Amino acid sequence: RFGDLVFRQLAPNVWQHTSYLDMPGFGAVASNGLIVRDGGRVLVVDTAWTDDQTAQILNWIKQEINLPVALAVVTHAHQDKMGGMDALHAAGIATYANALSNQLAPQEGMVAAQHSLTFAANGWVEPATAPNFGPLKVFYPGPGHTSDNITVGIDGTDIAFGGCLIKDSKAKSLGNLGDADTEHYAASARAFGAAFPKASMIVMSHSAPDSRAAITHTARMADKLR
């Protein structure tokens, strides 16, 4: 039911879900997402690589929490974050993604979410496109690792999730630059830091949670791209 995945409590109301890619050509690549308990409900950030693993996420919530799952947000269109979209849809869960991510989805061989988020000129999601997100604060830093990458803070916790935008403080490099925007990358990573200026824990797309140092390390590496 929920065997393959790893679930790690990061705060009383917040857990990290981790799933591993099984595909020929690849190592077992970790992908992280978040489960957030808000009062009498649960919110999910990102799926797992596959429908099956994503369903395991829902089974864990059922067994370990036993509150209904209100909504899911995906932070960019890639298999690792979007892979299980139809598992969410099949469970009757409302899904949200940046409009651009929904547009990119089919190009990526992935299913789009049900609703498109839009963003104000200052980078903050428009509350009309993100009803009842509660503690979830959603920000679009501008183009970075990808053009569609979005970021989320969790109110009352001091954790923020950069998605693919922020690399670990130990990272040798910025990783896959295929979708990257060379000139705006540094500015985007710094905008993220200023958007969640109080967050002491930055959740990573692949490795373990890091500190604000990751943000600085990333921006400085991106400074050399230009």
From Swiss-Prot:
Provide the binding site for Zn(2+) 2: 80, 164, 206
A molecular function annotated in GO for this UniProt entry is: zinc ion binding
Residues noted as binding Zn(2+) 1 in the record, renumbered to the chain: 76, 78, 145
Q: Name one GO biological process term.
A: response to antibiotic
Protein purpose: Confers resistance to the different beta-lactams antibiotics (penicillin, cephalosporin and carbapenem) via the hydrolysis of the beta-lactam ring. Does not confer resistance to the polymixin colistin or the fluoroquinolone ciprofloxacin.
Q: What is its EC number?
A: 3.5.2.6
Instruction: Provide the assembly information.
Output: Monomer.
Q: How is the cofactor bound?
A: Binds 2 Zn(2+) ions per subunit.
Its chief place of residence is periplasm
| Catalysis: reaction(s) | a beta-lactam + H2O = a substituted beta-amino acid
- Residues bound to substrate: 167, 176
GO cellular component terms given for this protein = periplasmic space
Supply the enzyme class, top level: hydrolase
Q: How is its activity regulated?
A: Inhibits by captopril, thiorphan, dimercaprol and tiopronin. This enzyme is not susceptible to inactivation by the beta-lactamase-blocking agents clavulanic acid.
Q: Where in the cell is it found?
A: Periplasm
Q: Where does this protein come from, organism-wise?
A: Klebsiella pneumoniae
Record keywords: Antibiotic resistance, Hydrolase, Metal-binding, Periplasm, Plasmid, Signal, Zinc
What's the cofactor? Zn(2+)
- Name of the protein this chain belongs to: Metallo-beta-lactamase type 2
Can you tell me which family this protein belongs to? Belongs to the metallo-beta-lactamase superfamily. Class-B beta-lactamase family.
Give additional notes from the record. Enterobacteriaceae carrying this gene (identified by PCR) have been isolated in Sweden, India, Pakistan, Bangladesh, England, Scotland, Northern Ireland, Australia and the USA. The organisms they were identified in were K.pneumoniae, Enterobacter cloacae, E.coli, Proteus spp, Citrobacter freundii, Morganella morganii, Providencia spp and Klebsille oxytoca. In India most isolates were from community-acquired infections rather than hospital-acquired infections, indicating the gene is widespread in the environment.
